[PDB]
Fold Exodeoxyribonuclease.
Amino acid sequence: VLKIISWNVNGLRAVHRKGFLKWFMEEKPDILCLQEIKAAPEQLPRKLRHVEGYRSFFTPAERKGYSGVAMYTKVPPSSLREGFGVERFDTEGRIQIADFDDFLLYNIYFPNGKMSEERLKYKLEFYDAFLEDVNRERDSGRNVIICGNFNTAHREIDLARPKENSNVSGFLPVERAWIDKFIENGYVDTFRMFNSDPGQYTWWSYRTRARERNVGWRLDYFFVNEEFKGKVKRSWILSDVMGSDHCPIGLEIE
Amino acid sequence: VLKIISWNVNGLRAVHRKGFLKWFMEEKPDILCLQEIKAAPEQLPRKLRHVEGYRSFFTPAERKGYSGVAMYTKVPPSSLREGFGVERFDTEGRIQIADFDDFLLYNIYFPNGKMSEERLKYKLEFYDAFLEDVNRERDSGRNVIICGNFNTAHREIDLARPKENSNVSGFLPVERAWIDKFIENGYVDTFRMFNSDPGQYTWWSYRTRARERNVGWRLDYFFVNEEFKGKVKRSWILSDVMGSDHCPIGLEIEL
DNA sequence: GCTGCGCAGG
DNA sequence: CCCTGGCAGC
Ligand code: NA
Ligand code: NA
């Protein structure tokens, strides 16, 4: 019976100033995966690097204040890999792959593609690189949990405004069609195992008070290889948890 | 009678959002000099590039959002130089030397030297290059007006806290001594021609609401060469004018 | 629009 | 600068 929370935090210091540690202590997950920490361990106060009861692992971007992932874990993994083995995907603080023996845990910050054609191309080629890696590990016989900010709403049910956003990154046909492809490779959007309601989102704009209106997008996911789905009991969204433009999401297994 | 205003604005777009053009048109100086505009002119609203009754000149830094000087003048100058002919000093949007025939106007944004040892070195060497340039012009017969953010308080009277800043850039012995040196070469701090009082500042920290308590430094100056000092009728601080960490300073000359 | 963080201001 | 005026997020 494990608890895992994934949160795209948008600044680990910012959330800290907002009461991250209290929230984390109230929630007591077995593993806490974070994305977009925008920080390297050296910029973090000692009480954030070292949380009583947890080993911490930070994978910052080469670029200061940019991107970065983190994992807190009551039980250390056996190993921790920080790349797909492709330099351009591996230096942006996007990838954590932790071996917990009963599964591999992918903690991924997938690229925003709305900036340019350059980055949308990078996002998609990142997607490609990820799929190879996850398939290679699954095909070798590992059960895999993937969580993080995928930066793509899968279906029209997954965002408040499906029609106006058909030409926007976050809901382009190429991106949606990569998630179809991913799922069709034997993986399961664990949230939609339990909940097929619309209005269920994980990200909202800061502008136009988008969160209060609930005009949002489901961008953050927990996926599992399908052979492992029986072991998942709960996959939910912690939508009342504030402090970032994303809310956290939760998974419970075995 | 000409009125020149000098203002280190810390963002021209920002001071624009706070009423700059209305203030500008009320003050109506013959020349307005601005430093630290933090803008290339392409980035500026149109009403900042085209001000009725003024030629405008923009000398941006290579670095985006950084430094930069501007000048608005009712009567255009015959030429405008944008450097001393030393490339590391000339790319940072710091220098405008405008030939107004009756005088040269130096609109200079002098470097902040408190970040690093490297930047303090740059500041003092920028000071050396400046003095050499103004001296050459002065020696050749030109009358010179120099306005801008010198980033140094000259004497104890030039800041609220002389004693605690004895070791801080803004008030280092090296920096104060350069101003001493500059003055010794034939140049006059014009505000001190008319006002010997303390508590006269042009810059204050945003932190601790220091402007509301007048806990400030006089970083912004109008200088002239000795030979031109009798032409200056007014040198004052526009300390009520809000919008930046600096306030504007003014000069009146009679030609 | 809005935000977090970088750099820089002095 | 505890305060303020590019890049990126989506
Ligand atoms: Na900002
Ligand atoms: Na800032």
